[PDB]
Amino acid sequence: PMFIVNTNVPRASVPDGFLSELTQQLAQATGKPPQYIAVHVVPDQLMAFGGSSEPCALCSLHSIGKIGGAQNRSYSKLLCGLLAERLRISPDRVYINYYDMNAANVGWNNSTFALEHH
Amino acid sequence: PMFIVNTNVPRASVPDGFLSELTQQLAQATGKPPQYIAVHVVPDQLMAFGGSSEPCALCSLHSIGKIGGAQNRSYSKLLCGLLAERLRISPDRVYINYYDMNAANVGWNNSTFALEH
Amino acid sequence: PMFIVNTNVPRASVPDGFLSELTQQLAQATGKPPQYIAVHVVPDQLMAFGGSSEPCALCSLHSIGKIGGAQNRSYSKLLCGLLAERLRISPDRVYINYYDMNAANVGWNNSTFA
Ligand SMILES: O=C(O)/C=C/c1ccc(O)c(O)c1
Known about the structure:
The structure is a homotrimer. With 118 residues, chain A is of the alpha/beta class. Chain A has helices spanning 18-30, 69-87, and strands at residues 2-7, 38-42, 46-49, 57-63, 94-100, 106-108, 111-112. Chain A has a single domain (1-118), classed as 2-Layer Sandwich (Macrophage Migration Inhibitory Factor). Helix content of chain A is 27%, strand content 29%. Chain A has a 4-stranded mixed beta sheet, with helices on one face. A two-stranded antiparallel sheet of chain A has the order 6-7. The longest helix of chain A has 19 residues, at 69-87. Chain A binds chain B through residues 6, 45-51, 53, 56, 58-59, 61, 67-69, 72-73, 75-77, 79-81, 91-92, 94-100, and chain B through 2, 4, 11, 14, 19-20, 22-24, 34-43, 62, 99, 101, 104-112, 114, 117. Caffeic acid (DHC) binds next to strand 4 of chain C. Chain B: It is found in: Secreted; Cytoplasm.
């Protein structure tokens, strides 16, 4: 799984340990080994949410499977809680786009995760 | 709705009220309250369009609904219009990827927009 | 086609000619004319892959068609090769998301591709 956070919170406000905590907590939430998890945090962004430049975040989570109604609600509670506690961003100023990727459409290590056909 | 612009135009060339302008214009175009509109502008990018580093932009518009053939051409005229006028980017050097998101696949406020099941 | 690379490799390590090489090689691999290929490289990113900050890349390739099982494997071999040779990123620390775009969902030049 791959998690990206873009935010107008400044770099100096991102705590030591943030990327490792996201890695661990995502591995736990998705039931996937942490070796697979990629995390990417982009601070100091020029952004508005509702026309206002109070802290906010635009995020994406891409996974092959483990995406769905109940699961995505759990991920949102986890990730919003982390963004609130660590970055001081209000949960109602956060969007997370969830993408259930097909294995054939994820490249890795010179190939893709679809090894069965064609 | 969420609109993201990545561009090689420098930061100093982005006008002070551009984020506010995009917000109001997208609210009107989509018929959604501005409170739901998020805008993200990323200047000074290392990018090329057709092998050239003249001004260009790579963009995305995500919405739950209000995405489709006729609507998207309307969004393209509006957004290219704004990019040309405000950032001085030729419309033929802009790409906009449109995504019609399912409510269940958009997280917000500790949950998603799918409150029904 | 639109190709984006986000990486923690520093800007100073991106070699002269990298965007041109990406453009030319994507044109060759996808068949599409180079005049319409857009490439975007974002270095110096705060990133981890498997919990480690050794060099890594998160990438996307969007194309109207030319996306599929065998074609995507070929793109991955090409693009991981370039990231390995040019940016010194191990291929097993690269993810590439492939998107087959509907022409009505791609804006360009005041309109769409449909
Ligand atoms: O990134 C995008 O928004 C898509 C751009 C694009 C532009 C021209 C093409 O022929 C194509 O397949 C895709």
